[PDB]
Design a protein around this ligand. Structure first.
Ligand code: 1Y6
Ligand code: 1Y6
Length: 264
């Protein structure tokens, strides 16, 4: 639109994302060019320090967001040789659990959490961006064809991301829906009715799924301490109803010594 001057493409998702200058405010913004109105009103009222601000909705459908240059994916890549320091891992994890708790207590699900979608600033903040309006962070209930999923899908994604900051490798780098499912099964064991009541009734569940044994989490995320492994295990419970909430995750002993370091 004529009050916005394009600076450069930020990325491509539903649509395309540009860095743009607002000619009216002089502000630099992220401009995303693309039932929906109620969804986008819920996003425009969601205001929290760990949620990217939806500044303006222009229907002529452009969504004007606050701009941040850096994301967690870019940061993980630049940090690959040394790793993200654990204080910063813990700070990023704690802040995303806060944004998620806010979202979830306002009946908003993210649905598509990934490192790419997590924007960081120079002061040590991290913010949920690009709400769901490639498969690595997908909860197994979504992969098993469940259409009426819960807030627990965002917890699973955040658990995957937590594991990835710790080990500097994606936890479950699936390249199709079945490879994704089977990567989850080879690590955590093939779910059954014992650990996940109702799993064998999921729309895309097949009795012919191979039966893998579970690996110990001490093998999965070394050198993470017992508090970090305890919390990760609770974020990665098969049964969405056993999966810890973002609010109860905030009171976990892992966050006892949480601080907010400056990234460098
Ligand atoms: O898609 C978003 O939500 C988004 C992406 C980049 C950015 F700087 C701000 C918002
Ligand atoms: O969902 C879990 O957390 C879980 C699944 C299988 C198992 F053997 C232990 C825990």
């Amino acid at each position: 639109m004529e009050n916005f001057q394009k600076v450069e493409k930020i990325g491509e998702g539903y649509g395309v994302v540009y860095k743009a200058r607002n000619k009216l405010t002089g502000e630099v913004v992220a401009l995303k060019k693309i039932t929906a109105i109620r969804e986008i009103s819920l996003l425009k009222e969601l205001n929290h320090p760990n949620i990217v601000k939806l500044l303006d909705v222009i229907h002529t459908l452009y969504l004007v967001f606050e701009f941040l240059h850096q994301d967690l994916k870019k940061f993980m890549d630049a940090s690959a040789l040394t790793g993200i320091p654990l204080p910063l891992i813990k700070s990023y994890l704690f802040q995303l659990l806060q944004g998620l708790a806010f979202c979830h207590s306002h009946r908003v699900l993210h649905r598509d959490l990934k490192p790419q979608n997590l924007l960081i600033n120079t002061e040590g903040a991290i913010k949920l961006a690009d709400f769901g309006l490639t498969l690595w962070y997908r909860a197994p209930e979504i992969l098993l064809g469940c259409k009426y999923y819960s807030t627990a899908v965002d917890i699973w994604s955040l658990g995957c991301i937590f594991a990835e900051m710790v080990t500097r490798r994606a936890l479950f780098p699936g390249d199709s829906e079945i490879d994704q499912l089977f990567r989850i099964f080879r690590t955590l064991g093939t779910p059954d009715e014992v650990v996940w009541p109702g799993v064998t009734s999921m729309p895309d569940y097949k009795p012919s799924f191979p039966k893998w044994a579970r690996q110990d989490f001490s093998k999965v995320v070394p050198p993470l301490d017992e508090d970090g492994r305890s919390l990760l295990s609770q974020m990665l419970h098969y049964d969405p109803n056993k999966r810890i909430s973002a609010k109860a995750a905030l009171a976990h002993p892992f966050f006892q010594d949480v601080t907010k370091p400056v990234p460098h």
